[PDB]
Symmetry: D3
Subunit: 162 residues, 6 copies
């Protein structure tokens, strides 16, 4: 059983406030991160139809500065479905309502595991793309996943050492 | 010059945290109201393509209790365009991911005014609906706007009286 | 059993901080509304001697800009007591400490329902005014309250339609 | 020039929210202190008719545990006025709306200095009490003051040694 | 049984954001004080090996204005250990990463009580200094402690009187 | 010109409050990420002697659930110094004050760029280790850095495609 990438796609529009920025009037990367995780977890929950935990934040690329009073659009979707886990891709776009432009300011990939009521890993549906963008993320997912798996081994060695 | 109710339609998915509730495990009306104004302001900004100020909160109807760990979907859209003002309707739905339900937990109507860079009221485009929901809010708007107009008078008597 | 409007009258002085503003050094409507609901709920709790829930924000009129560094005075009173329900009026004034001026910057009306421990609507005492202002809010409340009940139906039609 | 203690007296009712507490459902002392400073600054601003800075927090005595859902009443008053400095006393009471009790749960004393537009210490009016409580705080100030002054010296020695 | 002042010494580095300041770009004393309590309570729990409550804040001396984007270093240590109580001294330094200077911007003394699982005062180990700074606060605490005991009674009289 | 890993090592002790958790009494990963980014940026600033921007979050591995009332220790250090960039490793430990344990709950790597006052990349000193843990992170840095640079390209393609 399969769900589309659109089915669980979640949106979030926010305006960037003074309490969201640093001393440079530039948005705190940590605030951006917290929003990213919030939206992504909702997307993962919707796709799995279950509670989720964040296993890892695989990367956040901060591509463009985000200023006070900028309007952000966050798009989260499942880009990959393993057995009990999913990759969620979050796009952060600066949304300019004055010239109707949308610039890509941040890109993030996270990994969530679905759980049952007892906290055991839960099977999830597979996922499929419908448009060219979803397809891009879906098609590039398999290399990211194999990297995540290799990086898990490095973290394991690190933990074993400490 | 006109826009659809869709072009400016904004979404927001948020789960309900402790810091968002009262001691009863139920969501504080204040937090809910703050989310409403934020989302609606973004919508009016998209529609007017201009800065906005909230002129009034026409109403907030709390129709169902909202609990910690509930998943919220806010939908904001412009339901009416006057000269320089917009009515924005916000629907707050309880989104159940375990049984794929959606319930209407609250309903809010706001009025925003568009402004130029000098803080003067700006002309806005008109609005039109495309589906039966958009059309229900679009069709029922004219009475609400007049009731809003009447109530501005009542506020005036009151300011004068004090 | 009856209480004066003064018996439950509550006050709140607060300064307006950067975290309460948007990009234009102007107070966020949503923040003002959260403060309004908080103060109103305390007043209704005092009047009912019971836990309360906010059934509706009947209106918030934003009349004057509220700026960073402004001192706000909120006054909350019960202007109407139905069987289980209270209308609360909240006045928000900008308090100028340099020329002892007070300006009405916002006006709000909210509806609370008092509950027993098990969550069932509880009977509240009646209310009465003692001065000219209190009398004004009191005398105008029944028309607002009849509008509130009528609006409830519109909301019901909307829920039914959706 | 002189003012009563009552002319600058400030009130604040707030409910204690989950976000204000620690793991034991108990109000974070830090929160309480932030509220103290806020209400005290407003009071001192009123008295001095100027911008103010917190010179010192002379004490905060935590006397009764404050719990989630509690209603707090803060009362701030100038209990002493030197040349450019004001002592503000804040009383924090737990306000029980179920039985009309008010227990003193905290007491605090702070020192503010009034500043002119350029940042120099600004003269403030004298202060005088009108009721027995006001007289109590007013008459006991001289010992808190000489305790403040001796302690400024100790701070100086500490800075010097470091 | 004993512990050095170092064993429980806690550090906290934070940058000063817009949300932490008032309208003068300058750190809200309240924010400063919330951070103080947070770090000091951690040190006290570490030293006691138990839950703690804040009994009082004995003083906060605001020595230097702290501006937006400044880097703060908080250091908390136990400077005195009664039977069940601890004086904790918190030092607040402005950390300049450009010229590797540190300025003392605030100094604070708090008093905590250790509690057993049942909420009763719990005996704590004594404390000893190892360096010249630790010795300075250690050697000076007894005079502060006696000032604190005296001041608790004062606070008692105030409660009785009111 | 070179700095030890210890020279810029920054600590943060924090306790996990109700407002930091989700409905399962478990710390929000978003909150943990904000904290991570803050401490790491300070470490970056210390090492670089300059302002910094967060270029990317390379990973966050969530290894153990973190619960309310837990005490956290964050440790941030520069593990790699490129020309204008730094890798910062943040360790998050659950600190048990009752049995003196420290458990590794999360590990993160982030990448910062040093800027001059005009926003151009700035040269940073090199870094070197002094103890076995520092040496472990330093010695594993080269492989992560090369992975960072391969992944940046993927992101370039993705940006191009979109």
């Amino acid at each position: 059983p399969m769900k589309s990438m659109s089915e669980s796609k979640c949106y979030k529009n926010r305006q960037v406030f003074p309490q969201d920025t640093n001393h440079h009037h530039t948005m705190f990367g940590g605030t951006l991160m917290a929003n990213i995780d919030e939206i992504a977890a909702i997307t993962a929950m919707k796709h799995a139809g279950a509670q989720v935990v964040t296993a890892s934040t695989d990367s956040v690329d901060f591509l463009k500065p985000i200023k006070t009073g900028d309007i952000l659009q966050y798009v989260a979707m499942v880009s990959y479905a393993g057995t009990s886990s999913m990759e969620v891709v979050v796009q952060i776009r600066i949304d300019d309502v004055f010239n109707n432009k949308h610039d890509l300011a941040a890109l993030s990939y996270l990994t969530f595991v679905a759980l049952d009521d007892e906290g055991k890993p839960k099977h999830v549906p597979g996922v499929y793309p419908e448009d060219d963008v979803e397809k891009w993320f879906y098609d590039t997912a398999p290399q990211r996943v194999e990297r995540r798996k290799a990086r898990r081994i490095e973290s394991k060695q690190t933990i074993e050492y400490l």
